[PDB]
């Protein structure tokens, strides 16, 4: 549909006296299907930049045939896409109207700018801006995550109204449709609820929101936690949000690689040494494991799990806690160096980690804290009791479970003692 839906949106908004604008060879128009209409040689341009598609040229466009390779059947310019001039103007005007940030129906996700609307006037149009990028909204989101109908928070919403989402990406003055969804407001609110239910994890710090933003989640996979370096394909695939389908298979390796390449950065002047397995990365891993792998993952530490990857993650967390207690103010921790290899090749490195932890607890048993020294040994003894061997290798899913276990055990030890 897409272009026809923008045409319908122009028809809808153009009827109203406000919040819109009324301005106005032969062939068959592919937008309306009308026969014998004046086809357009060149469509009106679409705004780029701040009031348009971020990253695109000021006069970007959707339909363009500026090179011969793009022309078929001897047709010239936009004759390759026969659309009546009025329909072309209407759809371009609708897209420009939505692209205007003054209208509250626009959001930017990494590379692409997303514009959404409904087939009829509905409060969902101004509501969904918060769903894709959370800042009464919190009550709606918590209700949706639990699966309740949105009408329970506001009966005014007719959930049967169909909702459109369009994702555009920039190029050298020509745009690409990265994704496109159409569904009833009720259905796609259910899928967003499913998504947030999957992402649910105990927060690491009280300043972290309970409904992480999509941009914040994606930024945590980028190379240096910046909007650029976000993989456009990964952002586009993570469509999985509001379609309910499996997350892209590259998501888990991306998060694992980001954990592998990260380390504590006091240079940010954050007095707490920044975590490598942050709240958002753990949330992403949990969501991937629940959806794609159909595993059971708790929101908080589960000491009755007894899964070997989960147990190994917990053991790593307790070893790191012992290191932190034994060496206060240490610049680096095993978190920065051995986290990747321990998860990917436990049988090769855990002996060294355990010997280092023995050294750490030996220091504690002499210094004050003479028995958190015994407590950490008890934790290690209890966790290892459920393990028969250190596996030589673990799959990506097992590494994700390792990360989740490490995150859960680490949080349980912040203020246990």
């Amino acid at each position: 549909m897409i272009l026809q839906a923008l045409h319908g949106y122009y028809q809808r908004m153009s009827a109203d006296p406000d919040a819109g604008m009324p301005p106005y060879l032969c062939g068959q128009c592919l937008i309306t299907g009308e026969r014998q209409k004046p086809i357009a040689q060149l469509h009106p341009s679409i705004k780029g930049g701040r009031d348009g598609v971020r990253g695109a040229q000021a006069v970007a466009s959707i339909v363009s045939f500026n090179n011969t390779a793009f022309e078929s059947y001897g047709k010239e310019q936009s004759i390759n896409a026969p659309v009546s001039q009025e329909a072309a103007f209407s759809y371009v005007t609708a897209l420009n109207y939505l692209l205007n940030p003054s209208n509250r129906q626009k959001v930017t996700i990494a590379d692409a700018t997303v514009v959404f609307w409904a087939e009829r006037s509905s409060p969902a149009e101004d509501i969904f801006a918060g769903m894709f990028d959370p800042p009464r909204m919190h009550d709606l989101l918590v209700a949706i995550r639990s699966g309740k109908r949105a009408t329970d928070i506001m009966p005014d919403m007719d959930e049967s109204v169909r909702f459109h989402v369009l994702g555009l990406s920039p190029n050298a003055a020509r745009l690409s449709v990265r994704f496109w969804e159409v569904d009833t407001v009720g259905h796609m609110l259910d899928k967003v609820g499913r998504h947030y239910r999957e992402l649910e994890i105990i927060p690491q710090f009280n300043n972290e929101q309970e409904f992480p933003s999509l941009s914040t989640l994606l930024r945590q996979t980028a190379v240096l936690n910046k909007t650029e370096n976000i993989s456009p394909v990964l952002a586009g695939g993570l469509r999985a949000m509001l379609t309910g389908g499996p997350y892209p298979q590259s998501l888990l390796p991306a998060v694992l690689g980001r954990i592998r390449a990260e380390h504590a950065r006091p240079e940010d002047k954050s007095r707490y040494r920044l975590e490598v397995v942050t709240y958002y990365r753990a949330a992403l891993i949990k969501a991937y494991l629940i959806r794609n792998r159909k595993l059971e993952v708790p929101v908080s530490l589960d000491p009755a799990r007894t899964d070997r990857p989960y147990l190994l993650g917990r053991l790593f967390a307790v070893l790191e806690k012992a290191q932190e207690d034994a060496v206060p103010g240490a610049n680096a921790t095993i978190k920065d160096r051995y986290l990747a290899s321990a998860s990917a090749n436990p049988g090769q490195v855990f002996h060294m980690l355990l010997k280092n932890a023995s050294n750490h607890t030996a220091k504690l048993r002499k210094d004050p804290e003479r028995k958190s020294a015994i407590h950490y040994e008890i934790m290690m003894q209890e966790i290892i009791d459920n393990i028969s061997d250190f596996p030589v290798t673990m799959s990506s899913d097992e590494q994700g479970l390792f990360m989740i276990g490490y995150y859960h055990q680490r949080k349980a030890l912040f203020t246990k003692k």
């Binding site: 059947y73 190379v223 993989s231 456009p232 298979q249 390796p253």
Partner: protein, 270 residues
């Protein structure tokens, strides 16, 4: 000159070791990963580019083997041509440009609309099992601008696939060959290119790539004798018996070919 007389299908197994077989221009040049399965992906056009380069290097402007679609590997030493109204020019292009004769081309001509199809066809090549690319951080001594000079070092990154075995399928249509003169010597050159495709494509980013195995299904009849997808099934690629954990060499895989139908001959160029 006479075109080939049999339909062909071939399966090419190639691997990459600590390199980027094909970067993704939509993922910051990371190696392509299939979203649906997690398997590495290599587009057909990459392999076609490699074949074009190999043939250009090997024949270097011989009579019948000029390559039209060049990529700045050209050499202006010497050219010769056969010296043969749209049909005339089309046949002339086919008769002395190997890539046009093999893969086809599209000219800016009206009567036929430009369509020259060509017999050879290749599909996307995908890894046998999921790949986990590793990111490598590297530094450089020198800065490029005076502005950033004003402590003087820059840090970049490099994406590599630790190891991956890729399967590429292809089809050769004899009836199309009859319309462009793709002959048996061209077919032998094509097999040579496939088996030696990666030998001249060395670079800093690609690591070590090589062709491990090439199965060719030769059909008795001009058009086929069995469905192609059932022939591709005969090539079973599974992991060796004594190997566990992620694969790091071709020796970790076992590849076997089943018995083809009565109307098809199986040839193993590698």
């Amino acid at each position: 000159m006479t075109a080939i007389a049999n339909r062909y299908e071939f399966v090419l197994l190639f691997d990459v070791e600590n390199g980027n077989p094909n970067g993704d221009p939509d993922a910051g040049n990371m190696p392509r990963i299939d979203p649906e399965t997690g398997h590495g992906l290599v587009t057909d056009v990459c392999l076609k580019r490699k074949i074009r380069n190999h043939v250009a290097l090997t024949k270097e402007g011989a009579e019948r083997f000029n390559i039209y679609i060049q990529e700045k590997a050209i050499l202006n030493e010497t050219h010769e041509r056969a010296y043969t109204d749209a049909k005339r020019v089309t046949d002339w292009m086919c008769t002395n440009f190997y890539d046009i004769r093999t893969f086809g081309a599209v000219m800016t001509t009206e009567v036929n609309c430009g369509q020259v199809r060509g017999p050879v066809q290749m599909a996307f090549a995908r890894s046998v099992e999921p790949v986990v690319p590793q990111e490598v951080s590297i530094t450089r001594m020198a800065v490029t601008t005076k502005a950033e000079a004003e402590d003087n070092r820059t840090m970049g990154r490099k994406h590599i696939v630790p190891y991956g075995l890729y399967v590429a399928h292809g089809f050769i249509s004899a009836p199309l060959a009859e319309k462009t003169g793709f002959s048996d010597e061209d077919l032998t050159l094509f097999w040579d290119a496939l088996v030696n495709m990666f030998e001249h494509d060395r670079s800093a980013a690609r690591g070590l790539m090589s062709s491990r195995k090439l199965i060719v299904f030769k059909h008795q009849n001009r058009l086929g004798n069995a469905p192609a997808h059932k022939l591709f099934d005969l090539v079973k690629v599974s992991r060796a018996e004594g190997s566990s954990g992620p694969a790091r060499s071709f020796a970790d895989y076992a590849v076997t070919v089943g018995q083809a139908p009565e109307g098809v001959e199986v040839k193993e160029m590698l």
